[model samples]
Target chain A: SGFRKMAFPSGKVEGCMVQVTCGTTTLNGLWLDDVVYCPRHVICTSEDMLNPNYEDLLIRKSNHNFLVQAGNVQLRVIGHSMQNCVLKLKVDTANPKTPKYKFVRIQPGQTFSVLACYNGSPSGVYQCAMRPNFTIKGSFLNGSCGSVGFNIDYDCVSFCYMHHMELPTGVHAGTDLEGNFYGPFVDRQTAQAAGTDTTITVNVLAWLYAAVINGDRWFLNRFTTTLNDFNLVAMKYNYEPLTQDHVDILGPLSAQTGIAVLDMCASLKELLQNGMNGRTILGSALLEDEFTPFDVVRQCSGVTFQ
Target chain B: SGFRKMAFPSGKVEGCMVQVTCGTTTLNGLWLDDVVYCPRHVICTSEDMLNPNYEDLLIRKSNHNFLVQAGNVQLRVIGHSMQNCVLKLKVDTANPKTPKYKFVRIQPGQTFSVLACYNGSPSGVYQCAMRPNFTIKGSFLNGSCGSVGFNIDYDCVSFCYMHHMELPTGVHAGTDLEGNFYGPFVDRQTAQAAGTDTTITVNVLAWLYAAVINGDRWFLNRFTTTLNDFNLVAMKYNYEPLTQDHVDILGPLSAQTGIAVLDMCASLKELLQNGMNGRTILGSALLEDEFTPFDVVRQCSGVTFQ
Candidate 1:
C-alpha cells in the first residue's frame, strides 16, 4: 500500500521500472526486484518466480511436488522465458578438485524442465548459482561462458551420516547488483525511491534492536560476525560509500517503522528521546554521512565495518 | 546540569552572550548544551536552556508556554544575544522546487522574540529552523546567516474533523547541508568534536544497540533503512570516517554512557563471539583504524583487538 504511491522519474531514464505487475501481485522496488513478489500473508505462491535474470529467462517451481525420501530429495525447476537457455547446476562434494553438476535445456515458459535428485548418501550442504552459457566445453553446462546467474542451496543426508566429502575447485559464482549484493531483497525500482533506502536502514536497525532487546546472544553473534562479510561483499561489488542524509532520513521513518521493530524486540522504550544516543547517534549519522561514526564505534567495540 | 560543566574557551571570546538569562533560566553551550541537565531524567528544564548557540544570541521557549487549540497552536521562540541579527524560519513541504520562508529580527540578547502560530487546519506536518543573517532581501532576518539552527514541529486538530488545510502555497523551503538535511537535533559542537570521525561510527552502533535491547522497532526501521543515506550525508558535509580507536573509546564510555546501550541489546554473548560477522565486520572497520584490531577488544571482548 505504501509503495503504490512511490515513483522515481530519474530511475526510468535508466530504462528500469521499479515495479512490474505480474498477474495479481506487484513486484520490484527492492534489490530482490528480479525475484517474484510473494505477499506476506500468502506463503510462496504457485507463480513463485525463482530467478529471472538470464536473457529474460525465468525459473519457477513447476508444481507443489517435492520428493523427500529415505536419504534423498528431488525437485523440478522450470523455465518461463521467451526462449530456451542451457542450465547448469552444481553441488559441493568431499573432493575439493572436482565438483558435480547436473545439466539441462528448457524451452520457453513451460515446455521444458529439470529434475535434480540426490541419492545414495547425504553429501554436505552445497550452494549453486544457476548460469546459462554458450560454451560447448563441458557436457552441457559446466565450463565458463555464462551470460548471467542465480543461486540456490541444498542439503542432503545419508544412512549413518558418515559420508565421503568432495573436494572443490573454488570457482566463484555470479550474483546480484553485479556482486555488490546490496540487498538480496531490495528491488531496483524500490531501490530508487527515498523509501527503499529508508527500508534497508530500518531493517538493519530493527534486527539489531530485536537481537539486543531479546538479549539473544545467538542473534548478536550472528549480527556482529556478519558485519565484515557484508562489507566484504559490498567491497567486492564496489558499492558507493553511504551518505549522511541517508542515515538522517531514518529519524522520521523510525517513528513509523522503528517503533514496530522495537515492539518486536519486546523492549518498552518508545520514543527516540527515551533511549541513549537514540537522537544523538542518529543525528551524528545525519551529520556525517561519508564514513559513519557508528562504523568506527562498532569496530572499536570489536565489530568492524570498512 | 550537563552544561554546568561544559565551557568553550574562545566561545567566551566575546562578552556578548546569547540568552544571558530568560525569565530565570540561563542559556549557554551550543544548542541543547544547557537544557536543564536531566541526569537523564529527560526534562528540558526552563533552565532547559536548550539550543543556545552563538555567544551574542541564544534561542528558547518564552516562559516555556505551549498552546494547542483546535485549528491552532502557538509558541514563542525567544532570543538572547550580545549583538543583533535577523532570524529566518522555513518549513519543508510537499513541493520540492519552490520553498517558502518567514523572517524576524531581534535587539540585544533577551530583547527579541517571535510568536509562530498555525491558523489553519493541520496540513500534514511542518518543521522549522532558525537562521540569523545580515541581509534584508528575504526578510529583515535572512542573509549570510549565523552558525546555528533550531527546529520545531506543530500539530492542531479542529472540531469533529472540520478542519482547514493550510495549503499556503504549500511551497517547500531550502536549507543548509544541502538537502542532505543532517540534523534537526544534532548540535554544532558535537558535530565538530573529534569533529572526529569516531563520533559517527560509535553513535550508529550505540543507538542500534539501544533500539535492539529496548526492542524499539521504530528505532530499528529508522536505523536500518538510513544506513547508507546517513553515510552520504556525512560525505557531503566532509565529515571524516571513523577509526578503530574512535570506536574503542566506547569501552570506557560504555561504562559511563555506552554500557547502557549494550545492556539494552541484552546479548550476554558479549563481544563478537556469538554474533554474526561480529569479529570480521568489526575487524575490518578496526583494521582501518589506528589502534584497532582493538588491543581494546581484548580489553572489552577479551579477544584482544589485535
Candidate 2:
C-alpha cells in the first residue's frame, strides 16, 4: 500500500542509489566532525522522501543485513558500505618470547607515536613505537597489502583482566601514582600466615581497586605474595573450565579462548614493567583482540567502536 | 562402571550427609584462617573417602543447584546452603538525595571503620564507614530482627559504571594523584570547538581507559566536558530501548532495566565528588541488585561470589 510513490519498492534492495542516513544527531560538515554518520542504500518513496521526517531512526546491521526503522516506517538497506560497523583485522606478536613485541601497520588517519617496542618483522624500523587509538575502517585497504591485519605484543584485554580492571578509572594512590610496593610472600605463603581464623573471602577485583588503584596496603606491614591466584578459587564454581590450570586468579572480563594463563600474565608483566619504568605506551592496546578483532566483535557481542 | 561401589546408587542427591569439600586446597585451622570452605550436605560413598585420589576436583552451583565432578566421580551436591552460593540482602539509601550515602549493619568478626555521613532512621548512631567488603553468606542471620534487609545511600555499583571504570585501577595520575585540574566545557560546546572534517568513532570505554586512567591531556590544553555523553550516541541499533531516553551513552557493562539514564549519571557524580575530596568506599557493589539481591541472583544469572 505504501509502495505507490516508490523509487524502487520491488521488495528488493538492489541497484538502489538511495543512501539511508544512520548516525548520531550530530555528524560531520555541520556538526561534530569527529562524529560523522555513515551512508547506505535505501529506496525512499517519493512522498516520504520529499517531506522526510525520520524522527528516531536506529539502524541495526548484522554482519551485512541492514535494518532501519523510523517509528512505524521500516526500511531494509542494501549496500556494502554501511553494512558493517567493524573492521576485521589481525594483530600478532613477533615471536613467542617473554616481553614479546609485535608488528603494526600504520594508518594514514592516525598520529605517529613511538612506543616501547622491541621492533619486529617489517623492517623499516627506526624508532620503537605504535599508533595509539588507531581508527580502523570496516573494509580497510593497505594499498600494497590490500587486506587488513597487524600484530603487537601489548595485550590490553589480558592485562586488564589480570589486574581485575573492572572500570577504567585512574588509580588515586595519594600523590604516588602506582603506590607502594608490597611483596615476596607469594599468595602461597600469606594465606597460611593468617591462620585458624579462616574466613576466606572471594574477590580480587576489589583488591585491584584497593591495592593497585587506591594504594591502600592491606596489612600494616604488607609483603608481596605469588598472589596471581585465579585458578585456586574457581574450579569448584565456574561453569567454564580454564584450558590450563593457571587461570590468573582474577576472573577475566570475558574469557579469550586459547590464550594461555602464562601468556596473559607474561604480557601483563611486560606492560607493568614498562609503566613502572618511565615508558610511554601508544595505540589502542586496551580493546584490540587477537582472534576476533575488536571492531567487528559487536555483531556477536555488543562491544563496538564508537 | 564408577557407580559400582556407590552410596546413592541411583545418582540422586537428596539427604546425603557426605559434604564433598569444594574448597581451595588451603582451608581453616591448619592453613589460612580467613579462607574457609563451606561444608555442604553431600553424599559420598565409603571407598572414595577411604582410599581417595580427588586431585583436581571442581564444582558448579546454579541457584539451589550444584554439579560436582572429580575424575570418574561425578557427584551432584544437595542441601540448601551449598546449593545457592549467595545470600540475599537489601541495601538502600535513606532517601533521594544528592551526595547520597548508604546504610550498613555491623557484622560480628569485621573490624570497625568509621565513615562520613548524614544519619538515617536506623539510629544506632556514631559511625560513618561501611563493613568494607561485607561478606554475604548463603543463609545469613540476625539474632534480633531475623531476616535480610538494609537501606543506605552509597551506591558503589552505579558510581563505578558512571565513571567508565574499566578496571579497578588507581590513578597513577602524576603528582597531585588526581593530577592537573581541567574545567567545565560541558561536552555541549566542547565537541564544536574542534570543528570540521568530522571523524567520528566510538567507544567511551577507551576514553574511560584513557582520559580517566592514563591522565594523558588530549590537546595539550584539556578542559572538562559534559562528557557524561552516553546518550549522544546509541539510540539507534541498541535493539533494547532506553526506558526514558538518557541511556548515559557510555554503554554499560550490562544493561540495567528500569533504572533511568539520569539516575546512573547522578549516582556517579556522587562518588566522583567524594573520591576527589578524599573518602573511602567500602563493600561489594556489582553482585547486588534491588529485586534480585546479590547472593540469590546466581540461580538465574551465572555470576556467583566465591
Candidate 3:
C-alpha cells in the first residue's frame, strides 16, 4: 500500500552484471540471460563450498547472530570480493529494482559473496524488486566445477564470535598466582580454517576467571596458595592451547581456574534468573578460586554452601 | 539438581476437590473408585444442564474470563450448591496432592459455582497429591442422566466474549447513515433461563462504552445525535436488553445510543491497541459521562476527523 512508482520505463534495464569467462566452469544447463540482479549475502565454512547448500546465504541482513566457528571463517559478499570492484551498491533503499551491479572474482578458498543492482537515483519508492526472485546459470572459468545456478538479491554476513575476553592479573591479583588462560577451542580443522585474522574462540573463560579474583578482595594474602585447586578444575573445561598472550595476562591463572570460575558463575546466574535471593556475609576471608588444599573445611564463607 | 527435599512425611496430602451427588447425576460406568478431588470452577449458560456436557465444569480457577451469557448464568461448585451446605473450601496451591474436599448440589437456575477443599493447616508442605494424579466414579440420582467420565486434574474456563466488541458493526446500528451492528441471540430459553439474579450480558457492554468515552474527549459535543446513528449501529451488538438500571444511567441517552457508543468505543479501543496514536486537540476540556447530550455536533474541536 505504501509503494511508489518508478520514474523510468518499466522494462528499462538499469543495472549491471558480470560476463561469463565461459568454459572454465560450465554454465552448461544454467540459464543466466533473463535474471535480475538483486542484493544477496554469502557465508560459508570450509566444508560449505565443498557441499554448497548456500543455506547460510539465505539469512536476511537484519539479524546479526551469525557465527563462524574457529577455522571456519569464510564470510564474503560478491561485490566486496570482486577485483577493482567499487562496491558502492545501495541495496538498502526501497526500490529493490533500481539497477546496480559489480564484477567479481571467486575461488574455493573464499567462503562468501553477493550480486545485486541498485539505481543511484533517489526516489520516494523504497523496496527491493521481486524476481521471478531469479537465479542464473554459471560456473567458474575452471573445468573442475559443473554448471550451476546462483541466486541474486542478497544481504551481508561476517565471522566474528565476539563473546570472548581477556583480563589482566594486575586488576585481578588472585589470577596472578596461576598460569596461562587460553580460550576454549573448536576441533583442530575448525581452528585452522578461521586463519590468523579472527580470534573468535570461546573467549569468555578469561573474563570469568578475572571476575572471581576481582570479587574476592578481603583475603588476598591466602589466595596465592588457595588458588591452586580452582586452577586444576579449570583444566577439564579449557579447550585451547595456552598461547603466549594468555600466558602473559594470566600469569599462573591456568584455564583450569577459569573453567571453575565460569562454572560457578553460570550456576549462580541460573539461580538468579530462576528466583534466588540472599544477603552478603563475611567469614575467615576465604576465596572461591580454582584450587585450595582441602575440599570442604579449607574454605568457609557467609554464602550458604548448599 | 537444585531441588530440595521438603522436611515432612512422604505421604501428606494437599489440594481440594468436589464430591458428586451419587444417582443425582450419573458417574456410572464412569470410573470414580479412585480419584483425587482437586479445586475446580464450573460455568454454564441456561441450556447447559438440560443437555449437560458439564464440560465447563473441569476448568481450573486461575483466570476468570469465564462467561455465562445472559439467561445462561448457571455457575457453581459442588459443595457450594449442596443443600444445607456450609461450603467451606480452598484449594489453589503449589502442592497438587494436598487433600481437601466439599460436597455441593447443582440446579439449572444458578449462574456460577465451584468445587474444592482446603483445610487451614500450617505446614511446610501444602499442595495436591499426585495421582499417577487420580479419579473417581459415581452417578446422578436421576437415572435419566447417564454415566459419564470426569477428569481429576482440571483447569477453569471463563465465558467473557472479550473479542465480541471488535467485530464490524453488522446486523446493528444503521439508523440509515451507513451500517449495522449485530448482537447474537441464543435460544429464547437461553435468555429467560439465567433466572432473575444474574444480569451478565450487558455488563461488559457498559464497561466497553465507559472505556471509549474515558479515552476520547474532543468529540463529545456531536455525540448526542451522532450517538443516535451509533445506537442503531449498536442494536446489532447488544446481546442484553436495556434494563431500567441502564436506562436510568443513560436517561434521554436511550438504549440505542448506549449500545452504539459501546460498539464505537470497542472498535476504537481495538484500533488504539493495534497502534493508532493521535493527539487530543481539545486541550483538556473533555469530560466523560453516561448522559451528556444534544443530538451530536458542537463538540468537534481538536481530534482529527479523517
Candidate 4:
C-alpha cells in the first residue's frame, strides 16, 4: 500500500551480509506496505567504507500526535564491526537542508516505523529517508575503516490504522488536514480536471495555508524544520485572497522566526499531469522537504510504523 | 549559492576519483552541488578533462505553447556515464523538461539559463531524467582528449529567484497522494504552541492542492512513462456535483490531451514552489494511477485552459 519497490542502490556490501546472508522478505516481494532497506548496504569485497550506528525511527499520527517508535528497526552494517561508521538516510523530499537518521538500531529480522516530534517552529511539508553505517575494511579481510557513509534507501512501513472523518467543502480554503485522498486516490481522470475540484482542493489546502499563516504547532511540527520559502498559487478560478492578514500571518512565521512557507502548485505541469492531484502534491512536497531528528517523517509521510 | 567546503576531507588523491580532469579553462574553482562516492571511496574521475563538450537543449512549457529560456545553468552526469545525468536550472515562469543530448559541455564564458519541458504524462518525467549524460571527460590540449568532467561548486546565488509571489494557506483534507503531512493548527506563542516559528514553517500549499485537479506535464516529463493505479493521491477536498457540461470541455483535456496550464504570478519561488507542492503529492498520485488519463478533470475543475 506504500512505497513500492523502494530501495536505494549501494556501492558497498555489508560485512555481515557475508556472514549472515538473507534473502528478500515478503514485504519486499509483495511491495507490501511493510519492507525497508537496511541502514547500511551489505559488505562488498575490495572496498573501504564508512558505516555508522543507525536506528530506524518511526512516528505516526495516532490520536492527533506524532509518536516516535524507535529502535525497533536496525540498519544492516556491512563491516567487520560497528566502529567508525556514519549514519545517513535517503531523502524523499526536495529540500535537502536537513539530515536523515532513524531513532532505532537498524538490524535484519527486525522492522520498525519512523516516528518523531519537532521542537521549534516548523512549516512546509516533510517526508522520510534513512542512513546507517558499519565498519569498512581496506580489503574484505584486513583493510582499515573510515567514517564513510552514504544515503541508502530506508523505506519505512507505516501502520495501516484508519480513522473515520468527513471534511467540509466549498465554504473555505485552508489546508485539508483530514481529507479522503490522504491515503490513496486512484482517479487519474479526476487529477486532470483542474477545475472546480482543484479549487475545492485549494480550499481544503487553505487550512494548511492558514496553519502556515497562524503558526500552527502540528503544522510546523511536520514541515517547518526544513528551510523552505512559501509561494502562492494564482489561478484564474477560485483564487484565495492574498490579504495582508494572510501574508501578515505567514510573513511573521518567517520574518520573525526565519521559517518559510512554500507553495506547491507553482507550475503548469501541475495542472495537467495524470494521477497527480492537489493532495498528492501537498504530501509529496513535504516528503521532499526536510527529514530530521531521526526519522519521524520517514514513517509518517507514507511508510508504516511497525 | 551552492554547497561549499573549507577543505576536501581527504586531500584529493588519484584513486579517490573516477572522472576528474582539466579543460581549456581551469575547472578547480567552480561551484559544487553534490558528490557521488562508491564503497571503495571511488569518486567518478577522469584525466586530462580540460576540453568539455557542451550544448543547449530547448525546454517547452506545460501547454506546449511556452518555450522556456535556458539561462546560466549546470548539468552533470553522476552515476553511469551513459546513464541519465542530473540537471539543475534556473527558470522563469514556465516548464522545462530536459532536451536530448549526451555531453559534459559548459562554456566558462557564456551566459546561460536552464529550461525543462514535459508532455502531460508521468512517463515524461522519467524520460527527462534519463537523457543527457553530462559527465564525459574534457580535453584541454586544443585537440581531442578525454577526461571525465566535474563541477566543484554549484551556485544558486540568492534565495531570491521567486520571492515576490504570495503563498497559499489551507489544509489538504484529501489523501490521493502518499508521503504528505497534515495536522491541526497549533499556535506558536500560546501555552499550547508547539514551538517557535524559527523551528518550523507551515503552509496549506494550495498550488499542490490544485495541481491534483489538473494533470501535470511536469510530472510526465520528469518521472515516468506509464501511469500505475496503485500510487495515486487519494485526498480529495470536495465532491460536489459532476454535470455533463463540465465533462464536455474538460473531457479531452483531462483524459486524452496532454495540455497543461500554469498561472503566472508576481514572484518566482512562490509560484514555482506552490506548483511544486501540487506536483509532488498530487503529481505522484495521478501518475501512479492507471485508471485515468487525466482529462475529465478539466471540465469541472479550476481555470479553463485552451
Candidate 5:
C-alpha cells in the first residue's frame, strides 16, 4: 500500500518514490491517535547504505522522549538490491492512494519529483512540464536520484511504512502536540452530540493516564530518562507516583495542572512514535555536522509544490 | 472547549491556568484540519502584559514566510485586568472540556495547574494531590500564579483561541512538518473502501496544491519568505508555474518529487499551522538569548505526565 509508481517522461525507465517536502521540513509520517508512526525511508543503493548510528547517538545524548523511531525503517532497493520492496506486505501507510483522513494526519496535497537525477543531485527538468503548481521541476542542485530515466528511487521516503488496515491501539487519534490540538475524543460523533455520552475529549484522557499509571515504569525509566523537566508534567498535573484508576479525577486535574495535559500528550506521542519497538533519534553529527538540520530547514524554506 | 477549571488545595483560593508543559514545551493549541490556528495564551494580570512587538519583529526580521499570526491573538485578563476576560467569546479552542478528537488534535489526557504561585515563578504544592498519573503536583519552582492562593492564571495557555465551531478552510489537516504524516484524505471511511472512489491520501494533494497554485502569492511571498530552500518542493514536484487544474498530476507527481512531497507536506503543514492569519515566530531573543527553545527542550526532557 505504501509503494508508489513514479513515471518518467522521456526515458523508458519510470520512477518509483516515497517523499514529503517543503521547508521547515519533516518526514511525511502518519498520525494514528496522536502518535506519529511512519519512518523516513531513505532510498539507498544497498540496504547497507542505511545508517542507524546517527539515530543511536541522538537517543543516547539528547535528553527527552519521543515517539520517533525511523532508524530501522523498512526499505526496498531499486535495481541493485534485487529484493522486492516490502509492498508485498500491506500496512496503513501503504493504503495506496486512499488516506482515511479521519484517522490519517497529512496535508491535502501531494507533490512529485519529475526532475532527472545526475551525479547524486537532480539536473535537467523533464520536457513534460505541466502547470508550475501541479508539477515541481528540480534545479541542477537539489534533485532526487531517480525522478525519471535513473535507475534509483528518491533519496528519502518520508512516510515509508508497510502495514495493513487497523494500525493499533493508542495510535488512533491524529493530534499534533504543538498546542494546535488537544482533548480526549468521545468515540462516536453522536456520542458527543448526544448528551447521553458525556465522554468529552478533554475529560477522558484514558490512554495518557494509562501511560502514566500503567506505563510509568517504562515511561519514566525507559521512555524519558534523557529529559530534564521530567517532573514538570507530573507535578503540574498533580500526578502522584501511584494514583487510583479513575476518569473523573482527570477532568478536575486538568484545571490545576494547566497545560501539562498537552505536555504529556507530546510525551505519549513520542513514546508511541517510538513504539513498543526500540526507537532511534538524530544526533550531533546529524544536527551539527550533517546539520543539514537547520541547513535543510533554511535550504528548503522557500521551496513550494503545486 | 479549551478552558479547564484549575483548582487549588491551598487556602481559600482556587487556581486558574492555561498552559502546556513537560520540557520540549510548545503550546497546547487546537488543530483543525491541517493548520495550527491557536495562539499561546499567556495569562497575565493585565492585557498590557501582552508583548506583540516581538512578533512584529519576527515578521520583519525573519527570512522565511509563515501563516503564523498570534501577534494579535485575543487576550483575556484575570482579576486585575478589570475588563473581565474573553470567556465572553465562543470559539473552536473554546469547545470547553469537549475535544472532538476525531477532528480535534490533542492527546487523550487533560492536565491542570494546582501548584501555588508566590513570585513570578511558582512555589509550594497544593495538598490536594491525586493519584500520580491523573493529577500533576507542581514543584516549588515551576508553578502557576493562581494555582491556589495567588490571583493569576498559569504563565501560558498553550492552546488559546476564541472562534466558532467550523474553523476556516486551509486550516484543516493536522500534519506535523517533521517528517510525519501527509496525504489528501478521502473524507469518508467507505470512500477508500470502494474502488468506485480511487482517491487515495497520496493522490489528491488537494489543499496543499491549492496553497501552491491558488495561494502561491501568500504561500511563497508571505507564508514562506523567512525560509531558505524555497524551491526544493516545487522543483521536486515538477510543479509548473500556473498549470492545468487537475488532481491526476498530483499522484505521479508524488512518485517523481521523491520525498519533496513530504517536504512540501511539511511546508504546507507549517503554512496551515500559521494559518492565513499573520503568524509570529520565535527569535534569537526567545531562542538564543531567551534560548528557552533548546533550553526548554532540554529542561522538560525528563518530564512525564500521569
Candidate 6:
C-alpha cells in the first residue's frame, strides 16, 4: 500500500540555491537563509555584517548578560581593564536618561557592573549611566560607568525588564597631526577634571534620548491640579481609604517600613552630587533584616566600561 | 444605449478596476447626471447664495480665500507661570551662546509673533529656555523660577516655519503632598522675591518627545581603547563624533560667524554654567549684532519684566 506523502523523497528533492565559486553568484544549490538572489538568480548575501540580523532582541549574549529592569536605575563600575573588561546593562526602552554625553567611557563588552539600586515609581521617567575602574589604571583611558532612566506605567502592576547597552567609543590620551583633541582617555579625564570650570569645554556622554510613549496613566493624574486655588486635598485620589482630612494626610507615610522616604531622597541626592558629578558618593547601608521584598528580587543592570 | 457588453477600456488608464454601480435595468432607465432609483445614486446641487442667477450665466460658488503665508513663527507659553521670559536669537548655529537669554513676564492667552529668518546654515536647531524670578515665602513654603529646555528645527535658506506650545500639563507649583517643598511658582511678584534658592526643575511640554529623538548629538559610542588605547587613529572609524563637535556643526553662521572655534567652546561653557549656577554670563552680547535670526525675530515681542 502506498503511504500518504509525509516527507519528500531524496531523489526528487531539489536543493536550495547556494553560492560556491563566483564572488557574487550561486555555485552549488544552497545559500544563507533569506539571501537575496540578484541578476538572474545569482544567490548571494549582502556584504554588510553590521546589520546581518533584523530582530529586536534586547538581551546581550556574546560575552556578558546585560539584563536591565524598567524605570530609573543606577549602575557603578568597581574596576576596569582591557583584559578584564566589564559588563554593563541598562533599561533602553523608554528610559529617558540614556547617555547623551559624547565622551563618557561606558558600554557593553566592559567589566563594569551595577553598584547602587534605585526603584522606579509607577509612571515615572528614568535613565542609566556607568563607570569602570581597575586596580592600577583605575578605570581610566576607557569606559568606567553607565546609567539609564525610564518611567513605569501607572497601571503597570510590576514586571521584570531587561536591556543592554552597545558600549562607548574609547580612546587614549595623545595629540594628533593638528594637535587637536584625539585621544578619548585623556580628553575624558580632562573633561571630568575640569567639570566645574565654566569655560572648560570638554566632551562626555549624556543621555540624548529615551522616552516612554503614552499609555494607561490616569491613576497618576492626581498629581495634576487646577490653578484657581491649588488643592492637595482633592488630589489624593490615588491613595486608599477616603480620609477627607488634609492635615492628617500631610504627615509622612506611617505605613512604610525600614528606611524613611527622606533617606531615599537624600541617598539619591548624594549619588547625583558625587557619582554623577564625578565625585565620591556615600552608599546606603541597609540592615540584613530590613531588606524588604522590594529590595531582594528586583535586579537592574546598567551599561559601563572597564 | 442598452447596457454595453463587458469591455475593458484601455489607454492611459492602468491599474483600474471597473465595477458598474447600477444593474442592467437601472442603467437602462437612468439619465446622465440624474438621480436614479438605485440606493447609491444621489446627487445634490445649489446655486451660489450671494450672487443668485447671474445674467446669461450659470454660476456656482464654494469659494474662500486661500491660506496666505504669514512669514512669522508662533511662540506659545507653557511650564511654570514664568515671571520673566526672554529669548535671544543668533545666526551662528555653531556657537552655544548665540541665542542669548532675557527676562520677560508672560501670562495665559498671550501669543507672541515672530518673523522666520534662517541664519548661517539653511537648516539648524533652535534652542530655547524660559527664565523666571525666584521667591522664598516663609519657613517651609516658598516659590521660585523654573525653566524647561526645548529645541525646534528650521531651515534658514528655505521658507517659513511655525511652532505653537500648548500649555504644559502639571505646569503649576505646589507642595508635594508627600513632602514639605511647596510651590515652584505662586505669582510673578512672589517669584522675584525668593532669589536663586527657589528650586527650579525642567517643566516639559509636548516638545519633549521630539527633543529627545533628534537631540542625539550628545551620544557617544563606547569602545575598547588603544592606550592600552583602543581608539587609535586607525580605529577611530567605528566611533561617533563627540558632543562638542556636534554643537559646532549644528551652531549657525549668525551666532558663530567670525568666532574662533576655541572661543566658541569657551562661550558654551560659560553659557552652561550661567544656566546652572545663576551667574551673569558674558557671551550673551556676542549674538545680538549680525547673529540675530529666526529666534531673534520671535523674541522681539517681549521685554524684561524684572
Interface RMSD of each: 27.1, 30.2, 36.1, 25.4, 27.4, 37.9
Residue A144 in candidate 2, Cα distance off native in Å: 51
lDDT of 3 by residue, A272-299 (tens): 2332222211111111121111111111
Q: Can you give the TM-score per candidate against the true fold?
A: 0.19, 0.16, 0.17, 0.20, 0.17, 0.16
Q: Best candidate, DockQ-wise? A: 4
Tens digit of lDDT per residue, candidate 2, span A1-306?
000000100001001011123232211000001111121112122243333333212234332333232222333333322122211111121111122222233322211111000001010101111111222111101110111122222221010000000111221000000111111111110121211111111212212212222233222122222224433332332312233322343334124333333443333333333322322111111211111122112111221100
Highest lDDT against the true fold, candidate: 5
Cα RMSD, each candidate: 25.9, 31.8, 33.4, 24.0, 27.3, 33.1
Give DockQ per model, in order: 0.01, 0.01, 0.01, 0.02, 0.02, 0.01
RMSD of 6: 33.1
Q: Residue B74 in candidate 3 has what lDDT?
A: 23
| TM-score, cand. 4 | 0.20
* Candidate 2: C-alpha RMSD after superposition: 31.8
| lDDT of candidates 1 onward, in order | 0.20, 0.18, 0.20, 0.19, 0.23, 0.17
True contact recovery of candidate 5:
0.00
Q: Give the range where candidate 3 chain A is weakest over 10 consecutive residues by summed lDDT.
A: A169-178
lDDT of 2 by residue, B226-295 (tens): 4234333323323112222223333342242332334343333332333223221111111111111111
Candidate 3 Cα errors over 4 Å, as ranges: A1-306, B1-16, B19-201, B209-221, B226-231, B237-244, B249-306
lDDT string for model 3 (B1-306, tens) is 000001111111112212322212211111111321211112223344334333334232222222111111222322222111011222222223332322222111111111111111111111111011011111011111111111111122121010001112111000000111112322122222111222222323333333333343333233232334434433544322334444355333334345454444345334323322333211111111111121011011111000
Each candidate's number of clashing pairs is: 126, 68, 129, 255, 165, 85
Candidate 5's displacement at residue B197, Å, is: 56
Over 4 Å off, model 5: A1-287, A293-306, B1-89, B92-306
Question: What is candidate 6's lDDT per residue for A100-214, written digit by digit as tens?
Answer: 2111232211111111111111100111111211111111111111111111121111111111112132211221112122122222212322111110000010000000011
Candidate 4 CAPRI classification by DockQ: incorrect
> How accurate locally is residue A171 in candidate 1, as Cα lDDT from 0 to 100?
17
Interface RMS for model 2: 30.2
